[PDB]
Design an enzyme around this catalytic site. Structure first.
Site, PDB file in Angstrom:
ATOM      1  N   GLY A 290      21.080  82.559 -32.474  1.00 13.95           N
ATOM      2  CA  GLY A 290      20.319  83.830 -32.901  1.00 13.95           C
ATOM      3  C   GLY A 290      19.093  83.101 -33.645  1.00 13.95           C
TER       4      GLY A 290
ATOM      5  N   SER B  20      17.621  80.519 -32.537  1.00 13.54           N
ATOM      6  CA  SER B  20      17.093  79.616 -31.364  1.00 13.54           C
ATOM      7  C   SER B  20      15.568  80.270 -30.984  1.00 13.54           C
ATOM      8  CB  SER B  20      17.773  79.625 -30.244  1.00 13.54           C
ATOM      9  OG  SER B  20      19.056  79.167 -30.322  1.00 13.54           O
ATOM     10  N   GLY B  21      14.533  79.148 -30.870  1.00 16.64           N
ATOM     11  CA  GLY B  21      13.314  79.488 -30.584  1.00 16.64           C
ATOM     12  C   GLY B  21      12.562  79.680 -31.625  1.00 16.64           C
TER      13      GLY B  21
ATOM     14  N   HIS C  98      15.315  78.360 -23.502  1.00 23.02           N
ATOM     15  CA  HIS C  98      16.504  78.725 -23.185  1.00 23.02           C
ATOM     16  C   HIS C  98      16.627  80.485 -23.427  1.00 23.02           C
ATOM     17  CE1 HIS C  98      17.862  77.810 -27.227  1.00 23.02           C
ATOM     18  NE2 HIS C  98      18.640  78.958 -27.066  1.00 23.02           N
TER      19      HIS C  98
ATOM     20  N   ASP D  29      12.833  72.159 -23.764  1.00 22.00           N
ATOM     21  CA  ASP D  29      13.262  73.728 -24.189  1.00 22.00           C
ATOM     22  C   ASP D  29      12.121  74.253 -24.901  1.00 22.00           C
ATOM     23  OD1 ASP D  29      14.687  75.851 -24.757  1.00 22.00           O
ATOM     24  OD2 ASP D  29      16.184  75.081 -26.130  1.00 22.00           O
TER      25      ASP D  29
HETATM   26  C1  LIG Z   1      24.573  75.682 -22.522  1.00 24.04           C
HETATM   27 SI1  LIG Z   1      25.624  76.561 -21.382  1.00 24.04          SI
HETATM   28  C2  LIG Z   1      25.996  78.366 -21.470  1.00 24.04           C
HETATM   29  O1  LIG Z   1      26.966  75.820 -21.237  1.00 24.04           O
HETATM   30 SI2  LIG Z   1      27.954  74.981 -22.409  1.00 24.04          SI
HETATM   31  C3  LIG Z   1      28.749  76.278 -23.310  1.00 24.04           C
HETATM   32  C4  LIG Z   1      29.532  74.444 -21.331  1.00 24.04           C
HETATM   33  C5  LIG Z   1      27.265  73.545 -23.263  1.00 24.04           C
HETATM   34  C6  LIG Z   1      26.611  72.528 -22.679  1.00 24.04           C
HETATM   35  O2  LIG Z   1      26.248  71.643 -23.521  1.00 24.04           O
HETATM   36  C7  LIG Z   1      26.546  72.254 -24.821  1.00 24.04           C
HETATM   37  C8  LIG Z   1      26.095  71.519 -25.983  1.00 24.04           C
HETATM   38  C9  LIG Z   1      26.423  72.398 -27.045  1.00 24.04           C
HETATM   39  C10 LIG Z   1      26.729  73.705 -27.046  1.00 24.04           C
HETATM   40  C11 LIG Z   1      27.148  74.395 -28.524  1.00 24.04           C
HETATM   41  O3  LIG Z   1      28.045  74.024 -29.146  1.00 24.04           O
HETATM   42  N1  LIG Z   1      26.548  75.594 -28.663  1.00 24.04           N
HETATM   43  C12 LIG Z   1      26.919  76.482 -29.783  1.00 24.04           C
HETATM   44  C13 LIG Z   1      25.577  76.088 -30.770  1.00 24.04           C
HETATM   45  C14 LIG Z   1      24.476  76.626 -30.287  1.00 24.04           C
HETATM   46  C15 LIG Z   1      23.114  76.342 -31.265  1.00 24.04           C
HETATM   47  C16 LIG Z   1      22.272  77.009 -31.082  1.00 24.04           C
HETATM   48  C17 LIG Z   1      21.263  76.960 -32.366  1.00 24.04           C
HETATM   49  C18 LIG Z   1      20.955  75.979 -33.037  1.00 24.04           C
HETATM   50  C19 LIG Z   1      22.225  74.981 -33.185  1.00 24.04           C
HETATM   51  C20 LIG Z   1      21.932  73.943 -34.084  1.00 24.04           C
HETATM   52  N2  LIG Z   1      22.940  74.199 -35.057  1.00 24.04           N
HETATM   53  C21 LIG Z   1      23.070  75.124 -32.060  1.00 24.04           C
HETATM   54  C22 LIG Z   1      23.960  75.871 -29.128  1.00 24.04           C
HETATM   55  C23 LIG Z   1      25.358  75.889 -28.072  1.00 24.04           C
HETATM   56  C24 LIG Z   1      27.266  74.138 -25.868  1.00 24.04           C
HETATM   57  C25 LIG Z   1      26.809  73.254 -24.666  1.00 24.04           C
HETATM   58  C26 LIG Z   1      24.865  76.537 -19.507  1.00 24.04           C
HETATM   59  C27 LIG Z   1      23.839  75.364 -19.170  1.00 24.04           C
HETATM   60  O4  LIG Z   1      23.637  75.596 -17.769  1.00 24.04           O
HETATM   61  C28 LIG Z   1      24.549  76.482 -17.221  1.00 24.04           C
HETATM   62  C29 LIG Z   1      24.743  77.001 -16.077  1.00 24.04           C
HETATM   63  C30 LIG Z   1      25.597  77.899 -15.659  1.00 24.04           C
HETATM   64  C31 LIG Z   1      26.303  78.354 -16.512  1.00 24.04           C
HETATM   65  C32 LIG Z   1      26.973  79.338 -15.961  1.00 24.04           C
HETATM   66  O5  LIG Z   1      26.624  80.408 -15.343  1.00 24.04           O
HETATM   67  N3  LIG Z   1      28.553  79.308 -16.001  1.00 24.04           N
HETATM   68  C33 LIG Z   1      29.116  78.021 -16.350  1.00 24.04           C
HETATM   69  C34 LIG Z   1      29.802  77.571 -15.067  1.00 24.04           C
HETATM   70  C35 LIG Z   1      30.774  78.712 -14.404  1.00 24.04           C
HETATM   71  C36 LIG Z   1      31.326  78.335 -13.220  1.00 24.04           C
HETATM   72  C37 LIG Z   1      32.586  77.497 -13.393  1.00 24.04           C
HETATM   73  C38 LIG Z   1      33.365  77.112 -12.123  1.00 24.04           C
HETATM   74  C39 LIG Z   1      32.647  77.159 -10.848  1.00 24.04           C
HETATM   75  C40 LIG Z   1      31.671  77.908 -10.732  1.00 24.04           C
HETATM   76  C41 LIG Z   1      30.747  78.019  -9.441  1.00 24.04           C
HETATM   77  N4  LIG Z   1      30.842  79.666  -9.128  1.00 24.04           N
HETATM   78  C42 LIG Z   1      30.946  78.273 -11.763  1.00 24.04           C
HETATM   79  C43 LIG Z   1      30.197  79.972 -14.254  1.00 24.04           C
HETATM   80  C44 LIG Z   1      29.463  80.318 -15.767  1.00 24.04           C
HETATM   81  C45 LIG Z   1      26.188  78.074 -17.981  1.00 24.04           C
HETATM   82  C46 LIG Z   1      25.239  77.030 -18.338  1.00 24.04           C
END
Ligand SMILES: C[Si](C)(O[Si](C)(C)c1coc2ccc(C(=O)N3CCC(c4cccc(CN)c4)CC3)cc12)c1coc2ccc(C(=O)N3CCC(c4cccc(CN)c4)CC3)cc12
Ligand SMILES: C[Si](C)(O[Si](C)(C)c1coc2ccc(C(=O)N3CCC(c4cccc(CN)c4)CC3)cc12)c1coc2ccc(C(=O)N3CCC(c4cccc(CN)c4)CC3)cc12
Ligand SMILES: [Cl-]
Ligand SMILES: [Cl-]
Ligand SMILES: [Cl-]
Ligand SMILES: [Cl-]
Lengths: 243, 243, 243, 243
Positions: free
Chosen positions: B192, B194-195, B44, B91
């Site tokens: 940050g 991550s990886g 990722h 991942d």
């Molecule tokens: C991971 Si993403 C950026 O998505 Si969410 C923030 C909703 C997510 C999904 O499951 C999760 C589960 C957890 C977390 C979360 O809480 N995080 C914060 C913490 C972090 C983290 C990092 C490292 C260590 C640890 C452990 N403590 C945690 C991991 C992310 C976030 C999520 C994502 C995945 O595949 C994608 C594919 C596409 C996109 C993307 O490009 N977009 C979303 C869709 C949007 C859109 C809306 C309506 C219509 C259209 C059509 N044109 C598009 C455009 C923008 C985003 C993503």
């Protein structure tokens, strides 16, 4: 909505806006009125984590957000139990209203397709909403409802396009069988349009083919908009919503 | 890193920082040196979309980011072909450097686990990195490498926690079998990080159990950090990196 | 506006909104209609640097911003030549419209004070506008015109407050003689209200005592809002606007 | 600093950094060591409102901010009593250190000019700091001390330039008699350089001519940097700092 225009007041009588409580009742997602007492939307608008019902309201069709609000309480949120993220799928949810709406020619339900309905590639459909007008470009005040005409894409082609410029193995599905694609680099749904309707006129009748779900950005090369395929989940929908 | 403290200079000789070109060469993920010409990271961090290799460099173990940089360019980015998102899985990714690194007591490789190690609860494991110190809180200058000891939680127990306060059905798996859980509400990795590596001391040797992958926020109730389980991907890694 | 409430439709027929061209015609200051072809505002809203007149328009009294806009272009921007910053003074400017406005009970001019009115403490005065509702809090959609009744504080008393918790010497004047103070920690103007009117009812007639100019934040302890004292600038205004 | 480069370690032994308490001891302004126990800076860095002394520290000359900090407490903040804003003037302040610094060739005081010193137009001077590298462009990590050579401008010319493209009356002073100007569209001080030194080598001796005070942006057409004129305030300085 990317590349659209403002909708005529007579169009899209089923469009709704979902609102969350803060300094104001702010729009976060779209939905569609599919029965007088039920709204269809995307599960990612309201899940997968459980939300406080008291902090959610629905607004029926409005030309301009916030101007003439008459906010409706919700009595149940039903998120598909297979939903965890939009990329996995099952991105579909129901909101049961506290009361049935009194239908009119200006606000009324959309028709769901029959199970057998195939919305064929190329068929002209319309998506509507009050979402962003491009990546990171907010809909400006006075927040008109927008529309854009988008052609259905075949899944296999949409999946192939998502693989172009990606490391993902060509036989590893990105666009899954419960999803449907539409749009191009000039016309698309975008953030804030989520949960709203993709509708297609089939032999002169408007049917809801999709629910705005996700995509890689909005109107980006080789990345059409992805929708939850309504036909896929009819039986789940019909488990809660009267036919 | 949430909780824990600044790492001593003598520890984690395998930690790397991944940098993206912009106004400066900015840290965006971690990694680990697994061979003198190969870095292991999260998919990722570098995918699923193909990026410009010229805009990526790697920095070997540094006590403070940016102060004494000697950036190394990358010849290949190899991303697991099953990968599309961290929540789905796979991942994991590899970076080939344009040259072999010279190793020493200060900078050297980490040992990969044998296929059979399961890393049960109670094992002593540490995660390291320059990421955020809490949800939406940046690591302050001077950006010291941090470390924290994290407790392993068994996958089934971790999955069950992830379902508390979720609509997701209890038999729809969230934490998959190619992932590993560790941390609590005081000790976790964060954005940050991550990886980078999760390493566990097994019979006197440090082995890399995990690659920092995802979680629901950082150090939140019922939401341990999730790592890519390195043992699951040993065969793939060995397709590219010499033994 | 901090405190107070949404204005009734019948009140403040003289209030205007100044708009800057961008993704939409965005509200950035207020003003008042003082003649059918002239708006009075704050210099700091349109100066001290010369701006492109084509990028400025005025909207006459509207209950909700943006919903029913009929924007009017400007032929001249006339800024008091003593002006450089609001803290120095002469925070006053005039906009000539390309056409005269048609007036009515809903939209009409405000009366300027005679040179001799001093607007003492105890006078009933209101300030109106679409600005922020507290420090760094935006007026939410649908952006209603707000009003608040504000108490006048005598200049010497106001100046003395401005020196509490300041290094500035007590005999170095902060609130100058061409300014006027009003408001307290519950009732004030705020950013986005600048250039609009402070009006006081004197013998049955509404007179514009003040132009919203500056203060140390909004509704903060010992820091009343500061207005440009209109009586000080009557001669200047009359160089341009017919009597 | 706009248009400069990183300073040699041997240069500017009097440069200091002012730090405010938060998640880290962050740099907010520059200063100069003018006596072993006193720092010269801009009043707008530390006023006009009274600040908590416990939330302020000083850092002596450092090649890179934050890397080898040895933070020094301050025993008194002395803000010129005529100061309210930089545009009005008297933008000058002293910080008395809790201890005298032990001077060396690497950290030592700058020499103040004699009262009579006229720094003539065109004289090449240098300004130093860890400020922004252009409007809204932060100095990137690892935060090197920067320098740029800037010619002195005559007040009358600097004042005239500030009037070009402004509504302000030509006989109304913008650049006042206690201020001094230097810089052009390629070389300037900027936000974060405030309070630091403008130094000029006069017959082979370095004298501090100015304190970074304000300007309209950084390196903008017809808007040179404005400094407090040190000669103007020598007597106030000498009231507190031993000769
Ligand atoms: C991971 Si993403 C950026 O998505 Si969410 C923030 C909703 C997510 C999904 O499951 C999760 C589960 C957890 C977390 C979360 O809480 N995080 C914060 C913490 C972090 C983290 C990092 C490292 C260590 C640890 C452990 N403590 C945690 C991991 C992310 C976030 C999520 C994502 C995945 O595949 C994608 C594919 C596409 C996109 C993307 O490009 N977009 C979303 C869709 C949007 C859109 C809306 C309506 C219509 C259209 C059509 N044109 C598009 C455009 C923008 C985003 C993503
Ligand atoms: C008002 Si301004 C933007 O400055 Si202040 C924020 C430091 C300020 C000075 O006195 C004040 C007094 C009060 C407030 C304040 O609290 N306000 C918030 C509330 C608001 C308000 C609004 C309406 C009603 C009410 C009543 N409740 C209040 C008024 C502003 C702010 C201030 C300003 C005036 O003249 C200027 C001239 C120039 C600039 C300017 O361009 N810059 C500042 C200097 C900077 C720079 C730094 C180092 C070196 C260089 C040389 N290259 C430049 C570049 C950017 C800014 C200003
Ligand atoms: Cl319709
Ligand atoms: Cl180690
Ligand atoms: Cl009125
Ligand atoms: Cl020097």
């Amino acid at each position: 909505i990317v590349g659209g225009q403002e909708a005529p007041r007579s169009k899209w009588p089923w469009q709704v806006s979902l609102r969350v409580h803060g300094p104001y009742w702010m729009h976060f997602c779209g939905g569609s009125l599919i029965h007088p007492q039920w709204v269809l939307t995307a599960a990612h608008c309201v899940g997968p984590d459980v939300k406080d019902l008291a902090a959610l309201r629905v607004q029926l069709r409005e030309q301009h957000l916030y101007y003439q609000d008459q906010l409706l309480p919700v009595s149940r949120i039903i998120v598909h139990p297979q939903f965890y993220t939009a990329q996995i799928g099952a991105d579909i949810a129901l909101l049961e209203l506290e009361e049935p709406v009194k239908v009119s020619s200006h606000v009324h339900t959309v028709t769901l397709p029959p199970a057998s309905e195939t919305f064929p590639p190329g068929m002209p459909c319309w998506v509507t909403g009050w979402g962003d007008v491009d990546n990171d470009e907010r809909l400006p005040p006075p927040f008109p409802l927008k529309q854009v005409k988008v052609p259905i894409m075949e899944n296999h082609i949409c999946d192939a396009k998502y693989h172009l410029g990606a490391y993902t193995g060509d036989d590893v599905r990105i666009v899954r069988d419960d999803m449907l694609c539409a749009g191009n680099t000039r016309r698309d749904s975008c953030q804030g349009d989520s949960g709203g309707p993709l509708v297609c006129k089939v032999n002169g009748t408007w049917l809801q083919a999709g629910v705005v779900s996700w995509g890689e950005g909005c109107a980006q090369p080789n990345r059409p908009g992805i929708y939850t395929r309504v036909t896929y989940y009819l039986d789940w929908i019909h488990h809660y919503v009267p036919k």
